[PDB]
Design a protein around this ligand. Sequence first.
Ligand SMILES: Cc1ccncc1NC(=O)[C@@H]1CCC2(CC2)C1
Ligand SMILES: Cc1ccncc1NC(=O)[C@@H]1CCC2(CC2)C1
Lengths: 304, 304
Amino acid sequence: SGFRKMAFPSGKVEGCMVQVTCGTTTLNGLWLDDVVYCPRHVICTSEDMLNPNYEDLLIRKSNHNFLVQAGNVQLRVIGHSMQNCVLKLKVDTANPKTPKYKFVRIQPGQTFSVLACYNGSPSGVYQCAMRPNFTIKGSFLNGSCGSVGFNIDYDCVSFCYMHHMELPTGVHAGTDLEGNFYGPFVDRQTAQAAGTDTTITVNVLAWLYAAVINGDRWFLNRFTTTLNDFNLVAMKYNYEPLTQDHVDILGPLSAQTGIAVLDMCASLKELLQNGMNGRTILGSALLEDEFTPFDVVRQCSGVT
Amino acid sequence: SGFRKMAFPSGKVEGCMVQVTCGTTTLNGLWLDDVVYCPRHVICTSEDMLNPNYEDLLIRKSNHNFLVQAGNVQLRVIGHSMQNCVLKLKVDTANPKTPKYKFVRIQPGQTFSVLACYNGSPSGVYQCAMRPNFTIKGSFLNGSCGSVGFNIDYDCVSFCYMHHMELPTGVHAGTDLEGNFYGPFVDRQTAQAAGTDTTITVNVLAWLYAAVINGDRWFLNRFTTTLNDFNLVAMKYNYEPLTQDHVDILGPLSAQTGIAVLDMCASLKELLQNGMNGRTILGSALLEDEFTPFDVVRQCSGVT
Ligand SMILES: Cc1ccncc1NC(=O)[C@@H]1CCC2(CC2)C1
Ligand SMILES: Cc1ccncc1NC(=O)[C@@H]1CCC2(CC2)C1
């Protein structure tokens, strides 16, 4: 019993973190096999950030200009290429600690763990969600660029995020491991609109099931609703519209608890319309949307 | 910018986790040097749990009865001893992945990361606080016993907690690494009173400083208070009384922000008396007490 915002064990990712320096900028790199991946803005200076011409800046760099250090040992760079917003530094040594891994592009609403790093060293790990507007609300200071987000299925690490930018609003933006930004963002020090965000409805429902499983039941009511009626409420409260695909993914939790998905929707509807009335659910005084239905099943059954 | 409930990177602890089986019970062990530490209740059966005679149960066991498996390799047990509520299994091989470590007994109100494990395998990591009443609100299912809590200062892991029990209330209890329970708890399946808990005042203040540093300032007011006046409010709201030692520990945050500790206390006083009025602070709709002043300084400065 108990339900926590759990991150994946970060060990497999810790063994991939390196420091990448180019000129006066130092940030983090991800060393997998004989390739080090890092944000391409490692090649910029202060005068560049407003609108860097990355192609031109990269042309003035050679393999020997990229200083890559794994803990205390230096890696020899034998190639460099820019793919979208990431640099790929080919090194002469394959990382002995390379885990089984994949590069995946996550969907908005999905969750992942971030290993925050500075100068190639891990500082901490936390779980978060990719917002519906493709931003993340992380904890990143200058030097954290290149820190990655990932998920782990048994022995395979699926890398889904690499940190690149802090928007003027204090929210975070980054790319998949092929250097494609999530969202409309560009890697430049410019004010950039993040779309209107919404609350991840399917995740709040998953978390309400986690609450029932762990004893927090006060919010269960005698009502039901329909997808149409619920979606009118979700519209008013800036919640993502619920679809049958979302209901289908909540199936395991509905089956375990015996509470029909539309009945749980009616509980969520009443919580949106009436608030928590000074009460809490799983130690929170707000509706938590950072747990997917998969996260709830995994945590509630002790999957390692 | 941004402030998250960050756990320490768990890699150094992951390399110490082993599976310990004795009879029909399997749980987690911590392998450091040539010693495996685990809860002594691994030697119990269902009929024992109500009030196990651990000394008698342990006398019926021999070194060969403790099955210790590190991933896929079996460890040879050459000695066994019970120290308080932990078993120490001497093995013939020192853990090659033993990090620099210490065993520490944390104080109530201090925080630490837990690496939740099942069958010797890590499932996740989360940060929590040792409650003033010596319980922890974790996420532990059957099989998680032996999972540990720790802190990391550069390369040294300070192990402070080993999980033993879930109280009938769903809160968690465990020991230091010498097997001494935190709190009044005994390792038996019996209803056991946890003392009256309180909110960790110094941590809420630290978190209010973290909020100001990251832009959440709406709760700052034109008032001040005294330790005496504040402690009358803290008494009413079941907050720990604030002492000059707590004010002294908040010094770095008071100096960084320019907000005197007693001024921040006046903000906390008004939040306790008036509530949040449907607003949030660092993504929370309640007063968070799971960040120490040290955690706030570390996270706000990117210590690795
Ligand atoms: C200073 C900082 C803090 C946290 N996270 C990231 C950063 N850095 C940035 O956002 C810079 C400015 C724009 C950029 C994309 C090209 C990199
Ligand atoms: C079933 C479970 C779940 C989570 N954490 C722990 C447990 N197990 C226990 O609490 C047992 C019963 C009493 C005990 C101390 C001797 C071990």
